[PDB]
């Protein structure tokens, strides 16, 4: 009663590290983009689960997960053997604090990301009524190589041309992928090309400021921890709670050990 079980009806895998699969969504399953929910299995007899942003638009049919597979993780582990229908278990009760409504209004939103932790804007870039909130919405995806930008060919090719979102997303989505270990146009840690201006200068957008910039933040502890600082020099304020508004918003990828 505290999950539903559903068929996996696509896996995909984008590198050693790095694999999307999706599923059936069960009719009750209503989510605001950018929440997350608890995905799992069954493993000795008992359930497996860990929090998963749903990266799905709440329109969409099916659910889509982006996912790590770490080889001694407990769930991702097994989970990275997923096979098309294959059973894996979804909760019911979605949260996070990634929601449109808890941002204060502005011109300019950043969607600041690392690795799998593009994630829930997977989800808020399929949103069409994000674009009506903002002039442009900014995806920053830093990964470490060329090859672990995922879904790059949605964000350069496909989705301006969706046939349900491409008239929103063609002049106001803004893609920035960045590389951190090998040569690229964009190149290192989103924080420091943030700070240094290089951000600001390849977009076309000026420097960020309280009164037409927000943000939302899904990376590491360590990444939340540094960006938090740069937007606070740059004097937003974050939201102190879920539900509560605020300049941007945060939320872990995941929790270190
Ligand atoms: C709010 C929230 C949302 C999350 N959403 C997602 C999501 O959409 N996709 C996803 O892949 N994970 C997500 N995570 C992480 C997820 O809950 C699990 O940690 C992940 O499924 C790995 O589970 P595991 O049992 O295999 O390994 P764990 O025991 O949970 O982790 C093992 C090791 O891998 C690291 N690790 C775990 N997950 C990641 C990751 N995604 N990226 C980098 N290092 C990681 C941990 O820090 C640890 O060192 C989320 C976590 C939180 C708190
Ligand atoms: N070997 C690979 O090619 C590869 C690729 C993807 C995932 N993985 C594995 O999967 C797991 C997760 O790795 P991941 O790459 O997804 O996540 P990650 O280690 O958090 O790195 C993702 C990106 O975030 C950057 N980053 C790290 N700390 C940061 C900070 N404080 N502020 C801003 N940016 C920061 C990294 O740059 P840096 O390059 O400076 O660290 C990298 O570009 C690990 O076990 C890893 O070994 C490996
Ligand atoms: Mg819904």
Redesign the pocket.
């Known amino acids: 009663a505290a999950f539903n079980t559903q068929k996996v009806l696509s896996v995909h895998h984008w590198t050693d590290?790095?694999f999307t699969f999706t599923c059936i969504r069960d009719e009750s399953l209503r989510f605001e983009n950018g929440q997350?929910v608890?995905?799992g299995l069954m493993a000795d007899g008992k359930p497996?689960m860990?929090?998963?942003?749903?990266?799905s638009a709440n329109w969409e049919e099916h659910l889509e997960?982006?996912?790590?597979?770490?080889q001694?993780?407990?769930?991702?582990?097994?989970?990275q053997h997923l096979k098309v229908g294959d059973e894996v278990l979804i909760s019911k009760k979605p949260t996070?604090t990634l929601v449109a409504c808890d941002l204060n209004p502005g011109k300019h939103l950043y969607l600041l990301s690392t690795?799998?932790?593009i994630?829930?804007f997977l989800s808020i870039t399929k949103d069409p009524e994000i674009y009506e909130q903002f002039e442009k919405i900014i995806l920053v995806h830093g990964v470490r190589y060329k090859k672990d930008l995922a879904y790059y060919d949605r964000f350069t090719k496909e989705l301006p041309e969706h046939e349900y979102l491409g008239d929103l997303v063609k002049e106001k989505l803004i893609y920035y992928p960045i590389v951190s270990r090998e040569e690229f146009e964009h190149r290192g840690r989103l924080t420091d090309l943030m700070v240094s201006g290089k951000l600001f200068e390849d977009i076309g957008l000026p420097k960020i400021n309280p009164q037409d910039d927000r943000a939302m933040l899904?990376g590491?502890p360590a990444m939340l921890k540094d960006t938090c600082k740069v937007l606070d020099d740059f004097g937003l304020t974050v939201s102190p709670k879920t539900g509560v508004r605020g300049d941007y918003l945060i939320?872990?990828?995941?929790?270190?050990?």
């Open positions: 590290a790095y997350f608890m995905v497996l860990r929090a998963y942003s749903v990266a997960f982006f996912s790590i597979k770490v001694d993780g407990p769930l991702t582990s097994r989970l996070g690795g799998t932790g994630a829930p899904c590491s939320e872990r990828a995941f929790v270190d050990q």
